[PDB]
Amino acid sequence: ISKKRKLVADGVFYAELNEFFTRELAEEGYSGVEVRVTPTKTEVIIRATRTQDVLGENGRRINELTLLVQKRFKYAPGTIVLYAERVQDRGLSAVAQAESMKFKLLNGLAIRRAAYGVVRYVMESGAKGCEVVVSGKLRAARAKAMKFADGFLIHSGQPVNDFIDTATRHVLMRQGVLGIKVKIMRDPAKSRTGPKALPDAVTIIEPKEEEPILAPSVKD
Amino acid sequence: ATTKKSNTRRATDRHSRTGKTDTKKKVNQGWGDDKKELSAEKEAQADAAAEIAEDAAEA
Amino acid sequence: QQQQIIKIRITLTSTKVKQLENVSSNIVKNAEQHNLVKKGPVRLPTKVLKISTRKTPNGEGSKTWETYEMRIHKRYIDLEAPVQIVKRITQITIEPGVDVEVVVASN
Amino acid sequence: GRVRTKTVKRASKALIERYYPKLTLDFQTNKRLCDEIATIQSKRLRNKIAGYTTHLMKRI
Amino acid sequence: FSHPRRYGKGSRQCRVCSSHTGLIRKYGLNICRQCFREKANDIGFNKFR
Amino acid sequence: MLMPKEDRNKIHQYLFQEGVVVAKKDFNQAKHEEIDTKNLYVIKALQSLTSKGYVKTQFSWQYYYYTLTEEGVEYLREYLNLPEHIVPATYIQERN
RNA sequence: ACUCAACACGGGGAAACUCACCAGGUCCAGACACAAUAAGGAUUGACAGAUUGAGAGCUCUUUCUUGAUUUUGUGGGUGGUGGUGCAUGGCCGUUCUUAGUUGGUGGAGUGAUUUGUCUGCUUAAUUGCGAUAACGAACGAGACCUUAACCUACUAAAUAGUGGUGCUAGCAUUUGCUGGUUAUCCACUUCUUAGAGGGACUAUCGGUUUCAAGCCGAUGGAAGUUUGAGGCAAUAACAGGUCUGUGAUGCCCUUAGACGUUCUGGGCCGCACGCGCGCUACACUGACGGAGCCAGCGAGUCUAACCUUGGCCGAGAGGUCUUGGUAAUCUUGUGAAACUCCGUCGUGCUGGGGAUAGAGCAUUGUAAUUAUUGCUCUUCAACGAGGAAUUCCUAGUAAGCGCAAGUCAUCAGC
Ligand SMILES: [Zn+2]
User: Fold this and answer.
1) Recorded GO terms, molecular function (chain D) (predicted)?
2) Which of A141, A149, B7, E26 has the fewest other C-beta atoms within 10 Å?
3) In the CATH hierarchy, which top-level class contains the domain A5-82?
């Protein structure tokens, strides 16, 4: 198979997996997935919040996923090996927050309590800005779009791709379908990798106080 | 053949046709009330600080 | 048998330039450290896979188009090395998202 | 046209306040100075900063 | 209960949603144009120019 | 649905062995990928187990993913006359 | 879908499929629970006729096959390109890619609120200068990111390329000049590739203005119209479009004689006519014939029939025997078109124009009839520069010109 065809097919493999785990590991708090293709094996890492009961039972209801994985994509038992992994910075995961919003809205915490609830949880844990938009039907017939912004976030240019983490979820209920939009700007100071500031951010260093006049005052 | 379209009911698009309208109660019960904003907003910091306590205790 | 010098082409393919340059640099540096005959990393033209779709899922609106790109970066390194050293070089440089093919040159 | 934004005109004034001693009425040396003393991410903005800095130094 | 389905729009359907209309075949994707724009960045197709 | 007892037993045995089954949403597929039965029989057998709680279904990208539940393990054990001990593959050190 | 913001748009180029519509025929793919019915068979099946377009045991004739799966009622599901985009999500279009938006501290006002956010000049720009009860900031603009133009400077390379040599053919004697042999080989990296970095900041000078922001001239420079082009794009809105992209979805309708699904055939193309986007034209700056002969972006098959070279058959369309290529390697130097030369015509609906129409021969496909498409001969219409109107457009741009991709078995005036 050609390289033009192969890399595209690895793209569709990722994309099939991401969408699979999203609906399978809904309750178990799925952040995302990454895959590392080696010669022999193919490593996978399910990042998730609830990493306790994703595993469990010395493995009883977990590798169901890998058996489902090996069954569909036509892999041997020895090749593919997933891993459960404790997610870092639960606040900055936009996916986790929009997922947490759902569970709050299911058990019937009212919108404003739920929205301000999640906004403040983000903004506490290191977040330079936040946004939550909720749209749809809510008890009234006509639909409306409330926004719950806080702090600072840019909108345009390449920095969007760098910094801000978008995520969306659709939530089902008695009256219609309601829709969530959790932007989370994250601080460029806490970079880890890549640039540590916005392109606009000029920084000046102050000069040291030099004493005028002086004498020759030579040395050896 | 020559007679063009006779609009598509765009002249009365803004004016609802159902006849039913939303009371202030139904709106406020769904989307929260502006009078009871403190009660909603103060309970948010309680719900926020509850999760931060659980996040901290994971040594 | 092990000491027989074989002419080998390592082909590197990736969508991510940084990883691919790191892997390429590491292979070249390891080849230098072991005093192997190397023809350095030949950069092949980057293949730009281009898909152009209509933005809208329906008929409506101005006829606006979006163009998506996937860029495939390909490099090869030719080495003359015994079989044992080659297996060592390939295993050390497995970085996620870089594909590594090894071809033995038989004329 | 060529009209410079705030970040150009602001950071030019901010440099000249601190380093009117040091710097000249010549672009080439200024740009190379702006790398050391100021921490600019971009390369294009650095050349814009240093260009207006030179325009102000000419007026002084 | 079946008829020729070797070529044509009846044969080829979307991986995701099972729609025949508006497919992208290029590079063996077989994703409908709508679904592609959803799962474009996930696959690895990013906008640039 | 009317289904041969043999084909039904094959599906139940497979499901108990592996603890999972993956079926493409193709009702005209003459043979299932992993089981020597018609794909329609797999989908409709497992649909009947899911309606009784014995199997959890997920649907994605025109595939049905079936996972055997605890109640389903018990039901299949009784139905196949298997003698405690033998669990399904999903109890052999899962980890994924 | 119906002003801009419907009408070569739904990636909507429908032979079947697609498919929703029409005439007809099957299958249930009717979960589950309960009872009925019940193994002295609940219930599937099927030759041959009959029946039907049909080798659909659908139904009928008839008498086997099967061994509890189900059938039959009752609730209750499932599916729906059924309805409502004025019940919704997401997405996208538009206002607007215009320049717009907000708060901190201070001032004004009992207050809603206001000033900041402005007379003027300037900018592509709420871009800036300056004025100044405001001061200093943020989002948007800008910066950024991708791309395109320079870098005898680096980094290397037969999957790029050159110069001698190994070699070898002809012309010519003067060593030559012009070509084969892609690793027989050596050496370079200018051209080519892409990886780091550099380069432009209106540089420098002269004018002209609140001698401010700027603007204009001239010289260097690869480049001096935001360096050229995009991408991303605030606060918001609209009863904009989409339930016919979706196992995104509320409610309603329907659910075995189905609005589920599937098979056969038809239809979406049907023609007194009105409108929109286009293609081809009206000729002499042109048509026609020979000859010359130069791109760039592309894409391409492993268990699948993909891009196709070369040879041979054919007037042509094509056929046919092999081969390279999973691709900077082979197709492909995509020897593209306009154009370039030398011929032929001579102002006439002409040799401009190629509609309509007849006959034949191929190709794809289960199927080409209501011509899929191509090719050969024949037929040779309107149209002599387009009324009232009205669109697009300022530099490698307009316009002329063809090529690849998408769709695609086949079919481009898109
Ligand atoms: Zn799709």
Assistant:
1) structural constituent of ribosome
2) B7
3) alpha beta
